[PDB]
mmCIF file of C-alpha atoms in Angstrom:
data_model
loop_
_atom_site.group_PDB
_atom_site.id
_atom_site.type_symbol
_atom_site.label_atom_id
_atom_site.label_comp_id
_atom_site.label_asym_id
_atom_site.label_seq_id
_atom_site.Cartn_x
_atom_site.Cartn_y
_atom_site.Cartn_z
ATOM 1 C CA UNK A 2 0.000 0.000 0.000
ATOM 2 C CA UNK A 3 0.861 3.535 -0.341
ATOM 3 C CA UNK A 4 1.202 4.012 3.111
ATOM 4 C CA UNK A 5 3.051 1.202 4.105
ATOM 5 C CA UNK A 6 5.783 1.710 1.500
ATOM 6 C CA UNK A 7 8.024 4.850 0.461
ATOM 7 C CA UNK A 8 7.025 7.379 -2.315
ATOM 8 C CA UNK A 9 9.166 9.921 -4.543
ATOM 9 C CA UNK A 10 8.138 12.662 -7.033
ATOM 10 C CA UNK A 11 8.627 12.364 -10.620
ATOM 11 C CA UNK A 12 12.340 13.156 -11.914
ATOM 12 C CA UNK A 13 14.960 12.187 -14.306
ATOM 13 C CA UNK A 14 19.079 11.125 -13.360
ATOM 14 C CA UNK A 15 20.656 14.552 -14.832
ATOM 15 C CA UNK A 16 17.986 16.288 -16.783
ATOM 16 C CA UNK A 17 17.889 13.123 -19.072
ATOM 17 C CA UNK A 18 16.526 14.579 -21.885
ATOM 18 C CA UNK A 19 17.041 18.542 -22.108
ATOM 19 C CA UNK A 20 20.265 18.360 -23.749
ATOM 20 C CA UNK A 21 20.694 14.985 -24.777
ATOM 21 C CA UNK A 22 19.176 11.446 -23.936
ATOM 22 C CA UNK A 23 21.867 9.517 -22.333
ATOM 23 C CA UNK A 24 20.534 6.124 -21.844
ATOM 24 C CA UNK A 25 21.171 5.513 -17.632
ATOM 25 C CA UNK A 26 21.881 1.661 -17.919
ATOM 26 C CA UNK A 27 25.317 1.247 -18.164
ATOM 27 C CA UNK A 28 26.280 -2.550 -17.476
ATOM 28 C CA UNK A 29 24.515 -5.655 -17.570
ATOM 29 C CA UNK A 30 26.257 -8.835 -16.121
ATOM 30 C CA UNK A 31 24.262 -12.170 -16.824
ATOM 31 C CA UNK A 32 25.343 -15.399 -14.310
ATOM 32 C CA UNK A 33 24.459 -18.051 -15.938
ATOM 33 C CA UNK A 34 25.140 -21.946 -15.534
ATOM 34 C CA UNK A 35 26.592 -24.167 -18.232
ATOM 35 C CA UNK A 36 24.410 -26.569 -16.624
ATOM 36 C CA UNK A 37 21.295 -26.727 -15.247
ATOM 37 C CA UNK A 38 17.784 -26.529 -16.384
ATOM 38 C CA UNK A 39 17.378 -23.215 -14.594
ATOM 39 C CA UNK A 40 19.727 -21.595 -16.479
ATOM 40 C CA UNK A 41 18.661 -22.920 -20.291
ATOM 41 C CA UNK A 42 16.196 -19.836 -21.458
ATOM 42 C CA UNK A 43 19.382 -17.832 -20.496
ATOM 43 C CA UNK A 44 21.888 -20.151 -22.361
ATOM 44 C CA UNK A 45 19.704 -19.247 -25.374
ATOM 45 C CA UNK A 46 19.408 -15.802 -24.686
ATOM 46 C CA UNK A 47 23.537 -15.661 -24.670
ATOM 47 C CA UNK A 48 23.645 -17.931 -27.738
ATOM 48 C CA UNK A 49 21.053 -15.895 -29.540
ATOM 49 C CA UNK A 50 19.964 -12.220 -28.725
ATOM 50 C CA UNK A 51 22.679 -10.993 -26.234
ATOM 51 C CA UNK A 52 25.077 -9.758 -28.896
ATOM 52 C CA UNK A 53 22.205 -8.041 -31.151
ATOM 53 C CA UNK A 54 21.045 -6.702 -27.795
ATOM 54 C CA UNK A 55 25.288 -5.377 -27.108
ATOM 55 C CA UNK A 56 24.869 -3.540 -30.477
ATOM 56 C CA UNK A 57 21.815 -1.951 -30.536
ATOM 57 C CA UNK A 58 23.000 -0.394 -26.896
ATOM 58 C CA UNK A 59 27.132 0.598 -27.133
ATOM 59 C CA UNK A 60 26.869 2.274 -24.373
ATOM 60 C CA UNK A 61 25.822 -0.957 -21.823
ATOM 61 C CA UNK A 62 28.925 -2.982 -21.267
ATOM 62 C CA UNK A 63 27.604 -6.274 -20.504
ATOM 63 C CA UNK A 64 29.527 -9.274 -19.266
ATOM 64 C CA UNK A 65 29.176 -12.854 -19.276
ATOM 65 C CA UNK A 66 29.976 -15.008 -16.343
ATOM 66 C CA UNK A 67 28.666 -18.915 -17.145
ATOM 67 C CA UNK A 68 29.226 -18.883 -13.430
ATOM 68 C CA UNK A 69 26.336 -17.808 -11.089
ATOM 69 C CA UNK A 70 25.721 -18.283 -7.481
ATOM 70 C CA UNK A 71 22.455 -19.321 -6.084
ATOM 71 C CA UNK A 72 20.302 -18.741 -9.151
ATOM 72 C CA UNK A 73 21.197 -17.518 -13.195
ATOM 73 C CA UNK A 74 20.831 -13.900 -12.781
ATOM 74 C CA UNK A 75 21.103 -10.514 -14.496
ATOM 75 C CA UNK A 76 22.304 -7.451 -12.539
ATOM 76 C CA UNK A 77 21.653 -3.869 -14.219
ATOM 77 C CA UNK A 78 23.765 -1.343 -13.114
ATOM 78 C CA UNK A 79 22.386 2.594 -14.033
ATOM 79 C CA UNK A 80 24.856 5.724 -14.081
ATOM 80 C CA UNK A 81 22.977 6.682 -10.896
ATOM 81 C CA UNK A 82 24.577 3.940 -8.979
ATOM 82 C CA UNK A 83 21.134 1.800 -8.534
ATOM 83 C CA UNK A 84 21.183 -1.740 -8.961
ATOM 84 C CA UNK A 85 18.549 -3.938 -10.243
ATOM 85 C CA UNK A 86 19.203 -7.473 -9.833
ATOM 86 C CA UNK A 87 16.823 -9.845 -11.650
ATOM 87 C CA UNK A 88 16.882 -13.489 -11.246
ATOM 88 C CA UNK A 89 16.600 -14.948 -14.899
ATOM 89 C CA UNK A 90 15.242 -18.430 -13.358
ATOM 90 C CA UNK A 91 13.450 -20.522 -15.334
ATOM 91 C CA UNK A 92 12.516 -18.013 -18.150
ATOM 92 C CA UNK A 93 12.067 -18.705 -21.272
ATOM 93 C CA UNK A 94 14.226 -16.905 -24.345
ATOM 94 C CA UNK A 95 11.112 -14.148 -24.940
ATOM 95 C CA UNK A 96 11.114 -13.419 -21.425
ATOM 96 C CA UNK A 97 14.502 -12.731 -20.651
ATOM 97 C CA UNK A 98 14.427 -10.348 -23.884
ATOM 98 C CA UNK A 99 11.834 -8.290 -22.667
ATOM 99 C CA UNK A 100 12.964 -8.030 -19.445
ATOM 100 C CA UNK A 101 16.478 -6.884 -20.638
ATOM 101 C CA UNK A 102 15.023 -4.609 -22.463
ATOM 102 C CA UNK A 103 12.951 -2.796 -19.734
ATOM 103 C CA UNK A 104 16.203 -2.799 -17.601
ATOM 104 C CA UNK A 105 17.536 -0.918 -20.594
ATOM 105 C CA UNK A 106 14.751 1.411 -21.237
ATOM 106 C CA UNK A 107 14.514 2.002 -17.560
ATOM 107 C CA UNK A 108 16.245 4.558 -15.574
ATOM 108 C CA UNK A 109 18.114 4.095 -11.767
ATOM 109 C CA UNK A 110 15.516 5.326 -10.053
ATOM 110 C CA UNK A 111 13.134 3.067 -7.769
ATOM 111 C CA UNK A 112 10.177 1.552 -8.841
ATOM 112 C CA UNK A 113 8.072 2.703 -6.200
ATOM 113 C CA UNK A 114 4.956 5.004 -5.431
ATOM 114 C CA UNK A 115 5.687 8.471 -7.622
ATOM 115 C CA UNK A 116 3.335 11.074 -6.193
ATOM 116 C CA UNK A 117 2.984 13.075 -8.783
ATOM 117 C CA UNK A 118 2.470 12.322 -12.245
ATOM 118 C CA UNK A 119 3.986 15.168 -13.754
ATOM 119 C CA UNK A 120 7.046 17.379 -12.510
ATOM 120 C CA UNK A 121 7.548 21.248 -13.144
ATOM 121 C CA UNK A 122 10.569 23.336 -12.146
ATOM 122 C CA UNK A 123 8.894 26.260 -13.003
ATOM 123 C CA UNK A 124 5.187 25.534 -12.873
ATOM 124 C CA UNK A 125 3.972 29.005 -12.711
ATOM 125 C CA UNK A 126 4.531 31.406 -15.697
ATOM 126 C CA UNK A 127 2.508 34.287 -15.073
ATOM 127 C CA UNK A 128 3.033 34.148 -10.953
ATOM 128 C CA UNK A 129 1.770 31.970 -8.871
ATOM 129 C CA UNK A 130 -1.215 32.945 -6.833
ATOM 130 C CA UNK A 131 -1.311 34.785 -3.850
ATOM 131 C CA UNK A 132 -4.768 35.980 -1.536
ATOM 132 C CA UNK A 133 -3.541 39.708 -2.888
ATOM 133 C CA UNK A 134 -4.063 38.747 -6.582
ATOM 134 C CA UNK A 135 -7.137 39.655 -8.141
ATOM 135 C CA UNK A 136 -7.344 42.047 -4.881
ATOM 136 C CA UNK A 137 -8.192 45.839 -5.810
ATOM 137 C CA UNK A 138 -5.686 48.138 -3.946
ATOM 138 C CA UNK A 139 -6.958 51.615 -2.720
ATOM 139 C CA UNK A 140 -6.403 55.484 -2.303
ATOM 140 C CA UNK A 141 -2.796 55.340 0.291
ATOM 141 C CA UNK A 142 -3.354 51.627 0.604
ATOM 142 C CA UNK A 143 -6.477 52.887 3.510
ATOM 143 C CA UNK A 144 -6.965 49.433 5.568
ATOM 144 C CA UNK A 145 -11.277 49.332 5.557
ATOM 145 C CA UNK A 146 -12.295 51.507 8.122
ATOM 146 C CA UNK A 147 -9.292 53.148 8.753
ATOM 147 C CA UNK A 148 -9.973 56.910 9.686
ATOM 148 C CA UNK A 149 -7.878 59.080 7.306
ATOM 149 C CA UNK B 51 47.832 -47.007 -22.660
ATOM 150 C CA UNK B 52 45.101 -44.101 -24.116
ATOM 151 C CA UNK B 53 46.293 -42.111 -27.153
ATOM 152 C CA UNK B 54 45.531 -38.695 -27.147
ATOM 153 C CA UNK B 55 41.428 -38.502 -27.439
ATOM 154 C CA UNK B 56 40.845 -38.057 -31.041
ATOM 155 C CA UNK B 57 39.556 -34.658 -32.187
ATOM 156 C CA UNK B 58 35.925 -34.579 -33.570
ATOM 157 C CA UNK B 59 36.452 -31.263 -35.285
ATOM 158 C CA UNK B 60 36.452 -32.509 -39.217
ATOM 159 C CA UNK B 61 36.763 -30.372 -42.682
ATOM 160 C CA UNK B 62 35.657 -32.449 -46.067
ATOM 161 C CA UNK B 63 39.231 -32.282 -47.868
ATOM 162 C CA UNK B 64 39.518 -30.790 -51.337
ATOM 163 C CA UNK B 65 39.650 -33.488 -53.385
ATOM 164 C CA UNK B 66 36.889 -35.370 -51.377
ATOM 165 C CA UNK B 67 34.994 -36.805 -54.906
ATOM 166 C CA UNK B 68 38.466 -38.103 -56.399
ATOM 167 C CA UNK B 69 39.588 -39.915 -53.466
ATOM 168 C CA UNK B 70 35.758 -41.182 -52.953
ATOM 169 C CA UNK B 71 35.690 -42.608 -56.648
ATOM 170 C CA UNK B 72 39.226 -43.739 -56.200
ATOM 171 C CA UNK B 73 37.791 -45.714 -53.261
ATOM 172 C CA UNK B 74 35.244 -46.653 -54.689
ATOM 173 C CA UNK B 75 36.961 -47.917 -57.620
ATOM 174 C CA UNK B 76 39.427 -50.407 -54.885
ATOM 175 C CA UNK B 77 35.930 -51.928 -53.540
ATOM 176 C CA UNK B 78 33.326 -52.299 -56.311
ATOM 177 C CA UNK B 82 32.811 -49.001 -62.461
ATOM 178 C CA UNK B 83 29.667 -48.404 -63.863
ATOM 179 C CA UNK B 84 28.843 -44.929 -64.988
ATOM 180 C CA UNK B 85 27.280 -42.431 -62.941
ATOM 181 C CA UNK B 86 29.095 -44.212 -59.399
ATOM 182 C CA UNK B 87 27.369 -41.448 -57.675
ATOM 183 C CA UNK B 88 24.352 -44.151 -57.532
ATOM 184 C CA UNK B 89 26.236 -47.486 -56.539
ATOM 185 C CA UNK B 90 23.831 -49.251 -54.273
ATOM 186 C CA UNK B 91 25.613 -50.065 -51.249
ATOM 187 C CA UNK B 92 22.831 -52.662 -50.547
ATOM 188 C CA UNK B 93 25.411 -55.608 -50.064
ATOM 189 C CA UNK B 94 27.137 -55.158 -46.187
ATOM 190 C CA UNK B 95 30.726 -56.652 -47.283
ATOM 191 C CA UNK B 96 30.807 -53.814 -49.917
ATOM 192 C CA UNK B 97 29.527 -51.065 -47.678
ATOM 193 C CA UNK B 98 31.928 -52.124 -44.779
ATOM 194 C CA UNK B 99 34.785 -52.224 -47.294
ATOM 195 C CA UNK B 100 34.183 -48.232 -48.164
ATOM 196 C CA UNK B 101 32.873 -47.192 -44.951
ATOM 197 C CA UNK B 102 36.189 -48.781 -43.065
ATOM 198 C CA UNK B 103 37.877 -46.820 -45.507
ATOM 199 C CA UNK B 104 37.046 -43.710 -45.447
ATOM 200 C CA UNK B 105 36.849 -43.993 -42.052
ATOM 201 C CA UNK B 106 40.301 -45.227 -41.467
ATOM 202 C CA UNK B 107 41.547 -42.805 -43.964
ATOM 203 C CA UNK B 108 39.549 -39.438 -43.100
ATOM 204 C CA UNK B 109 39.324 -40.188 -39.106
ATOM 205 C CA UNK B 110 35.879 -39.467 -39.421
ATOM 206 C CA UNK B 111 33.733 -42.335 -39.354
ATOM 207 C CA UNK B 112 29.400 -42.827 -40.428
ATOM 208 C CA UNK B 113 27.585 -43.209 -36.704
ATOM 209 C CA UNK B 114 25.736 -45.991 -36.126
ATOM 210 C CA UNK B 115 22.417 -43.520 -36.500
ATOM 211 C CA UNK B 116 23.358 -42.139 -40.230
ATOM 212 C CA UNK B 117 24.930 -45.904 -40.948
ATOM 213 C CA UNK B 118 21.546 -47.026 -42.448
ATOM 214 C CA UNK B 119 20.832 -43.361 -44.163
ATOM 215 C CA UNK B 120 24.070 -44.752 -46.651
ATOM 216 C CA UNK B 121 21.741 -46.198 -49.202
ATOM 217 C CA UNK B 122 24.721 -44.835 -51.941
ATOM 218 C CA UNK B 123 27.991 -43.348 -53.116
ATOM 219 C CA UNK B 124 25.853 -40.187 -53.164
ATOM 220 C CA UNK B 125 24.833 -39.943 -49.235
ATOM 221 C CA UNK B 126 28.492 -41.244 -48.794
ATOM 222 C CA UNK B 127 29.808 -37.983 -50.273
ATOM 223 C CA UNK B 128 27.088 -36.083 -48.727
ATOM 224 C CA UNK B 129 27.936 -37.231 -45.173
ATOM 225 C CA UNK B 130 31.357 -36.729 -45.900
ATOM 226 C CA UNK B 131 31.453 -33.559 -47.716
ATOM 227 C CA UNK B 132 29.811 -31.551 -44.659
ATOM 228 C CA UNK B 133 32.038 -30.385 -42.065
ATOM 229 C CA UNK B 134 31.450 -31.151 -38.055
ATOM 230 C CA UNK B 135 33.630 -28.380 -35.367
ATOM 231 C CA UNK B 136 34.403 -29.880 -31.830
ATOM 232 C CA UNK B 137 34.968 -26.309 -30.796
ATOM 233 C CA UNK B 138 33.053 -25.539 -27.147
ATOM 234 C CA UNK B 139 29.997 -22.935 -26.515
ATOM 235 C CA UNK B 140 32.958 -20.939 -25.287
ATOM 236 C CA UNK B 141 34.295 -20.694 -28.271
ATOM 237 C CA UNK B 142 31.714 -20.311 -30.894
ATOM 238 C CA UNK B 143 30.942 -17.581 -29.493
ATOM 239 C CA UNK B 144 34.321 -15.766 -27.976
ATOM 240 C CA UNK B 145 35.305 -16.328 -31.649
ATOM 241 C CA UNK B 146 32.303 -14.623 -33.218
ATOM 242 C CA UNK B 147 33.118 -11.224 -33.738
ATOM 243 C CA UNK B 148 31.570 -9.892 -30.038
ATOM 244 C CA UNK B 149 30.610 -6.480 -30.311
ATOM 245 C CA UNK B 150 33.473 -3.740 -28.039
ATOM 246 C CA UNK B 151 30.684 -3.866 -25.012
ATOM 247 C CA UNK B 152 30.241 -7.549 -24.826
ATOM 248 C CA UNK B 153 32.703 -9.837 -22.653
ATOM 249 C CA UNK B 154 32.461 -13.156 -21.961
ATOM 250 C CA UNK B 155 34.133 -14.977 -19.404
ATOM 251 C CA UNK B 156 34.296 -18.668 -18.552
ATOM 252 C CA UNK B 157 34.984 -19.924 -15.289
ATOM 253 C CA UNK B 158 34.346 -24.167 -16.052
#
């Protein structure tokens, strides 16, 4: 529930997209077991869409290990320093795809309640209001009642 | 005592047809030996043993009935078969500058 869990507002790494896009996932490292049933969707994955995947993002390093620990796993690291660890257990080929690829369309920050869904740094342009606008001044600012 | 473990990787040699047809000569003529029924087993053993002992690459068991001719002879023999590892098909495959792979087995 909202309550029982912590909440940001809406925002990018580094002002991700005024400037330039700079895509926030920077490594990738898949464990995975030469053997083990576990492990087979992301055998295939290696054999067949990991280096079509390395091109089509230069700017991911991703390693390799065909050595995991505990489960076959892939751990996304963003320039923000997060890290995403995903286990890769037992998925099929088309699963471990997609899921790569929301890691890489995905930015650092956590996947949690976002308060807001919009976020301005300037969200007023012709001043924001105040009780005194749209408030009629009068002759030597005279408070009502006031005698002179 | 074990000789070194023989090496399944296997490329079809150049002149694959002309030492086939030579063989084929030793055993068995006709015209066309592309189509020489190897129906009789002494005749079949006598090429297959030869090319096997000759090539180091020998028909399994599974393909040994699938050798109905001279023609699946050559065609067994004249498609290659690399003993290279996972690791290797695909450290030698032209990985991409952000792609490492590293192998710990």
């Amino acid at each position: 529930t909202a309550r029982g869990t912590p909440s940001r507002f809406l925002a990018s790494v580094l002002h991700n997209g005024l400037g330039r896009y700079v895509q926030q996932l920077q490594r990738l490292s898949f464990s995975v077991s030469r053997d083990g049933a576990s492990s087979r969707g992301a055998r295939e994955f290696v054999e067949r869409e990991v280096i079509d995947f390395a091109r089509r993002n230069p700017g991911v390093v991703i390693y390799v290990n065909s050595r995991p620990c505990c489960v076959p796993r892939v751990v996304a690291e963003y320039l923000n320093g997060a890290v995403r660890e995903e286990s890769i257990h037992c998925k099929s080929v088309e699963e471990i795809s997609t899921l790569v690829q929301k890691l890489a369309d995905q930015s650092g920050l956590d996947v949690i309640r976002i308060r807001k869904p919009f976020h301005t740094d300037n969200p007023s342009i012709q001043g924001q209001w105040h009780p005194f606008t749209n408030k009629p001044t009068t002759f030597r600012g005279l408070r009502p009642r006031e005698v002179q | 005592v074990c000789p070194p473990l023989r090496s399944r990787a296997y490329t079809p040699p150049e002149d694959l047809q002309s030492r086939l047809e030579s063989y084929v000569k030793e055993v068995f003529l006709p015209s066309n030996w592309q189509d020489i029924s190897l129906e009789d087993s002494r005749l079949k053993f006598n090429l297959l043993a030869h090319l096997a002992d000759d090539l180091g690459h020998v028909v399994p068991n599974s393909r040994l009935h699938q050798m109905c001719r001279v023609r699946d002879v050559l065609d067994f023999y004249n498609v290659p078969i690399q003993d290279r590892s996972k690791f290797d098909e695909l450290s030698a495959s032209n990985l991409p500058p952000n792609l490492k792979i590293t192998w710990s087995y």
